[PDB]
Amino acid sequence: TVESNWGGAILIGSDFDTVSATANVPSASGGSSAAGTAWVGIDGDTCQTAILQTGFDWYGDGTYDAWYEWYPEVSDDFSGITISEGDSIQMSVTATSDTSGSATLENLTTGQKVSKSFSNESSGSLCRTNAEFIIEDFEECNSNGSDCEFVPFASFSPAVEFTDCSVTSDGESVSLDDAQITQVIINNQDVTDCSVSGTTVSCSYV
């Protein structure tokens, strides 16, 4: 099954404050339930207690969803925005403390913009030691967070690309050159081919 569910760029550091990028909405197939998503966030890799993140997902039935999440709390979909094949989505998160922050999703194609703020989040605390641009095989569980299943990973195209990637550690821009590269791997085979070049993280389906 799924051995590696994250594909993209992961920076390992400390005191990360902001992560932002713009990404395009691809088309997807593979069945009604197949899915995939693109997002930006802080923590979730070496730091497992929490994740500040936002992005959009895609399903094989042609549907889409823009969302935000403060893991370990369940994610939530945004109501004032639409996601359509080809749209360009500016996404960004800002951690203001280990328990507070905000997420913003802007559809540069439809000019729509949604946002969410977080304060005194008790579920979990950020370590702010990870920053990333990811394409993920995510999961579906019950409200609680148990009985989970990874969703079938939808094939997609064209390659989803994170552009104008920006990260800051205490106000200072951080180099995307130290970033680690991961691939979504299923059954010990890569199903993504992600790569970094300049300020662009590019991932295509394999």
Binding site: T37, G41, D45, Q48, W67, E69, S75, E139, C141, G145
Partner: peptide
């Protein structure tokens, strides 16, 4: 319900 951890 959707959950985004590595």
């Amino acid at each position: 319900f959707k959950f985004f951890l590595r």
